[PDB]
């Protein structure tokens, strides 16, 4: 992977894993997630980081995903190579936004775009914050001045309101626990593993004869190791869409909420 | 990736990436056993592939009877690490496919594995001796001399490794795989059974030794409906033997041994 040439984005190719792809031999949207985080980490690294800057350090603050929005138009193949460039932009003091663009390597055709949206927080109490004028502008020599989003349209389905599922659920997985896999270098869950539990309680029979083409997550609280989470799906719907929930299996406090669109395959 | 000049072993080299790694910033056993199945499946595709074709006119399949792993340093985030994958016939008994992992800056072995598979109706799940036909048609990928990864006299690779006895020391229950756990057949991935293993190793053994050895004998399937129970009872260096059944009728899916380094 590397910096583009005005040094504002990253691009990085990956080739698709035999372990990384589905029934139809295509990747995953769990893979397609793991690879949008792989080349976000590695542009942070190539501009300095370690999301944290040095006034974050300083004040114990970090950044954490509020929502994450993927539309994939084609999964790529095992053993296909999808191009992935990505970039950052600061939104005054509400937060930051990573975008993303998936190509395929070959024909140059756009086959997926994700965009996220992050908000500050302190390390130690977990509470939310604004971003400073200090944080703002150590950021903003890395980002492009000019707005350059994923999705520009004018009412695009990632900045929708998101309503709570309201019991009973049509359909549901109970008891899902993280495993050591499910955790990263810090030893919490990974952003992914929420995208797995959401899809969880959706039922095999739509999986096995639709494509997910579009899902929206937003991120309430963080599931501890120790803790166990239920996942909660109902029809909203040639399209079908679905509404989710994930609360812990115990008191139902929200972890997240969000909604999917499938296609008929 | 690529067969090496001989064309009897392919070489494959990989970056360690951010979520492949552990607390201490270094690729955990399982992104290890994930890079050895994709490097597998890398050579058997370049060779015209696993099944053969007199496999798949008689439905037939290999599937892995055990798993040895051991790790000398594990790579780090950002690190590139070489594997060197081949096979080789082990009679009518079944296959072995062996790998050498090594750093690709230094050239140093970093670490070493064997797996052991045997044939077997993909319908009926009865395991079988391996044909003549099939036989041959595997002997033109893999060395004819012996080329063993863990070559030495009664080592590891190959102990029997007995059953744990009621009550284990740790245990983890109730474990079920998610659709990341499967495989494109809906089949659970080996690699989730090691992860499984792992579950009921207590955090504090996790946070103060490297695993450095793994010995997974595979006995049954855990179906995508199944529940597990992993249990752990240390026999000790730290050493331990595990166990894998299902939650309810208490059926062994695996039995293994692990042994840890204090950092
Ligand atoms: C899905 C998904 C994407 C990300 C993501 O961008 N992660 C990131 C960006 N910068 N750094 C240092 C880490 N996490 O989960
Ligand atoms: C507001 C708000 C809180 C959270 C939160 O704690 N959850 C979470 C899960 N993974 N990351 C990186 C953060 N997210 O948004
Ligand atoms: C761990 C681990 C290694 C393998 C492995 O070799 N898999 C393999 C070999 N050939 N093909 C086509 C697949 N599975 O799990
Ligand atoms: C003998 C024998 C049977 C099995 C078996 O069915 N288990 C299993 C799990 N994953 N794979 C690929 C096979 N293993 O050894």
Redo the contacts with the bound molecule.
Sequence with gaps: GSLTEDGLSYKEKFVVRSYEVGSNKTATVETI??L??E???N???SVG?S?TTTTMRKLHLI?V?AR?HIEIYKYPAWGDVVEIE?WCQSEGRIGTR?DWILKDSVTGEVTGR?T?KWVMMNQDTRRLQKVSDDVRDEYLVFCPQEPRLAFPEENNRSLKKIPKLEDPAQYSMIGLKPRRADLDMNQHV???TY?GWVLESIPQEIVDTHELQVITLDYRRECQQDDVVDSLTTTTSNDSQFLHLLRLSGDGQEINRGTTLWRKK
């Design positions: 997630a793991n949008l985080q080349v976000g980490c542009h942070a690294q980081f999301a950044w995903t994450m990505t990573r994700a996220s990974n952003n992914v995208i």
